[PDB]
Amino acid sequence: GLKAAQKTLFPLRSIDDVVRLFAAELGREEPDLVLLSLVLGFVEHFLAVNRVGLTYFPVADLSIIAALYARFTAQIRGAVDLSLYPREGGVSSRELVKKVSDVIWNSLSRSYFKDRAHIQSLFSFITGTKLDSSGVAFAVVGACQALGLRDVHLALSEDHAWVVFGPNGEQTAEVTWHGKGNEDRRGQTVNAGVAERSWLYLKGSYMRCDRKMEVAFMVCAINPSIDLHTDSLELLQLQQKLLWLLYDLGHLERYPMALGNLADLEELEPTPGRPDPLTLYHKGIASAKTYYRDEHIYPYMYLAGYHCRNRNVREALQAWADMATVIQDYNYCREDEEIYKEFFEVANDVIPNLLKEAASLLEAGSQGSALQDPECFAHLLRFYDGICKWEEGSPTPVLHVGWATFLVQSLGRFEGQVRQKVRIVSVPVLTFQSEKMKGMKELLVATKINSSAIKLQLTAQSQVQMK
Amino acid sequence: RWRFPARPGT
């Protein structure tokens, strides 16, 4: 049962009408996740997946949306008999959460590409029987709301989603898959992953959503992609307007990644009278420092990316150095491969390209070049230091010889006279945390870097060729 | 393609 007050804005005839619906729901005791996800999925389908016939905006008629809502609530209420799972004290049981997870899981198409765009929403679940990884977690939370289970909430790391529930909201349960070819842990807590200090569980400093943050998640989950070359302007506008709505109400306060998304949108198409992208990226970092012990990587990656795109080399290097300063206190574990790929691409592709362009510009007489700034060299060294310290104590190594040629090249982009200015001190001035960089210190100021010795010190390799 | 909601980059 949609309530009478939920129906009065239909039909939705524009972006702004969708925004009004979100504003109305966010003003309610609890925003209706099912309704809002169905609307977003409907509007995304007809703006990104199939634009045949589009003349302005795909009008969302109440009859259509209500029929979709009824399919969802019918399935869930039919398959989950709450009488089998008595609720001690206004809180849900692990068995109940697992049952809801199973109902969503078991509904899905037997075989489909899980990496497709536009399979995030309950519209996808209902019309295509398809969901992406995190979409399954959202759908479990939407189903639990539909069942009246006020204590079940979405939990988010930077690369995974699960639920919290139970007495004081203190229980965790896996409800979806992560990655590819990992083994399902649905029903289990996340405690092993927290205890092993993996990036995937953020040492426990992950997001525990309220209902409003769950709305923010579905908005971040909007995918404006039409194809590899084209985005939907309509969906970008919608996402941007919804994020500002949430921002103004306070619901992005504890959501760094949403703040960075909003900053990226503002760079693309600034809203008059709003904060600059940089202000927003800094707010994201502040959010991570305030609520999550400064244990998140992506607030710094968002900032660095902005600086990189705008060829602020100094500030890009500083932000990637900061990114490494966070990662150093993690152990690199089996399902952390996405953050490995991000650091690998920065070290072995992005930074080299940036420094190569800097080198051409210096040849053409640029002033205040990062390549002549010793604090820029210090940032490069701190980036590598953090990666090396990350590797310390980890169950799987990080560095290999495929990193070493890029390190030598990048070091060599700074002339010896620049490199000499950095003073490396023990516990521009820099202090290394990692044993690998401490051993590398003397190699760092020679006019021509000793490539071979660098390679030996960065990697496990301890011998040179026999012959 | 698929990326985790609000992950930076592409």
Residue numbers in the entry:
A (entry chain A): 2 to 53, 74 to 386, 399 to 460, 549 to 588
B (entry chain B): 6 to 15
In the authors' words:
To understand how these mutations affect the interaction with MLL1, we tested the binding affinity of wild-type menin (meninWT) and four of the most common drug-resistant mutants, M327I (meninM327I), T349M (meninT349M), G331D (meninG331D), and G331R (meninG331R), with different MLL1 fragments. Further structural analysis revealed that point mutations in menin occur in a site that is adjacent to the MLL1 MBM1 binding but has no direct contact or clash with MLL1. Furthermore, T349 is even more distant from Pro13, and the T349M mutation changes the conformation of M327, which adopts multiple conformations and approaches MBM1 as a result of the bulkier side chain of M349. However, similar to the M327I variant, the T349M mutant has no clash with Pro13 in MBM1. Since both M327I and T349M mutations do not change the charge around the MBM1 binding site and do not introduce steric clashes, these mutations have no impact on the affinity of MBM1 to menin. We found that the binding affinity (Kd) of MLL1160 to meninWT and all four menin variants ranges between 0.5 to 2.6 nM, indicating that all these mutants maintain very strong binding to MLL1. Our structural analysis clearly shows that all these point mutations exhibit a steric clash with the menin inhibitor Revumenib, overlapping with inhibitor fragments that extend beyond the Pro13 binding pocket on menin.
pmcMenin, a 67 kDa protein encoded by the MEN1 (Multiple Endocrine Neoplasia 1) gene, is a chromatin adaptor protein that interacts with MLL1 (Mixed Lineage Leukemia 1, also known as KMT2A) to regulate the expression of multiple genes, including HOXA cluster genes. Menin has been identified as an essential oncogenic co-factor of MLL1 fusion proteins found in acute leukemia patients. MBM1 binds to the central cavity of menin, utilizing Phe9, Pro10, and Pro13 as energetic hotspots, which occupy well-defined hydrophobic pockets, and positively charged arginine residues (Arg8 and Arg12) that are involved in electrostatic interactions with the negatively charged binding site on menin. Importantly, recent clinical studies found emerging resistance to Revumenib treatment and patient relapse as a result of somatic mutations in MEN1, leading to point mutations of T349M, M327I/V, and G331R/D. Understanding how these mutations affect menin structure as well as the interaction with MLL1 and current menin inhibitors will be crucial in the development of a new generation of inhibitors maintaining their activity against menin mutants.
